[PDB]
Design a binder for this molecule. Structure first.
Ligand SMILES: NCCc1ccc(O)c(-c2c(O)c(O)c3c(c2O)C(=O)c2c(cc(O)c(C(=O)O)c2C(=O)O)C3=O)c1
Ligand SMILES: [Mn+2]
Ligand SMILES: [Mn+2]
Ligand SMILES: [Zn+2]
Ligand SMILES: [Zn+2]
Length: 144
């Protein structure tokens, strides 16, 4: 229904989102850091790594203005969201089984926006945004 931006929205605040979970305890964290100096980290129970990545995106949509840049390192989160947008009101579309409720909450937030840019980056070493939020969500969840 929607058109995600082809390139970052110049001027808009950028949310570097991430999540991490531990399979053995199902504990996890999801959150963001932004280039305007905000951050947020929430602790979650009964969750998975995929669920935490989606939850971080939901948090960024909840806390942002009408134009938002979001940078994720979850290929899954980006793919399931983009596929939802491209295939609604379209033939031959079976909605995914896993995480359907969370993705529906995200799409809810997405359509309320004016412009959204969503990009995937591989996780990497450094001092940039994806690295910072990685350390935040990995604290006490997985070794780094
Ligand atoms: N110092 C460099 C190595 C390093 C150090 C610290 C890190 O935290 C990570 C690291 C992440 O922080 C991270 O969040 C992720 C990964 C990382 O490797 C992934 O690899 C990864 C992630 C999400 C995904 O959805 C996939 C998928 O969907 O397939 C993959 C995939 O591997 O395939 C993902 O979220 C990597
Ligand atoms: Mn990640
Ligand atoms: Mn990461
Ligand atoms: Zn606007
Ligand atoms: Zn970086």
């Amino acid at each position: 229904m929607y058109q995600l931006e082809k390139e970052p929205i110049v001027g808009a605040e950028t949310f570097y989102v991430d999540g991490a979970a531990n399979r053995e305890t199902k504990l996890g964290k999801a959150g963001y850091v932004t280039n305007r100096g905000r951050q947020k980290v929430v602790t979650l129970t009964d969750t998975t790594n995929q669920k935490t990545e989606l939850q971080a995106i939901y948090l960024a949509l909840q806390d942002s203005g009408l134009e938002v840049n979001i940078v994720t390192d979850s290929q899954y989160a980006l793919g399931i969201i983009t596929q939802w947008i491209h295939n609604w009101k379209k033939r031959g579309w079976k909605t995914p089984v896993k995480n359907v409720d969370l993705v529906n909450q995200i799409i809810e937030q997405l359509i309320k926006k004016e412009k959204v840019y969503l990009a995937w980056v591989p996780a990497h070493k450094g001092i940039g945004g994806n690295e910072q939020v990685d350390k935040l969500v990995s604290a006490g969840i997985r070794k780094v």
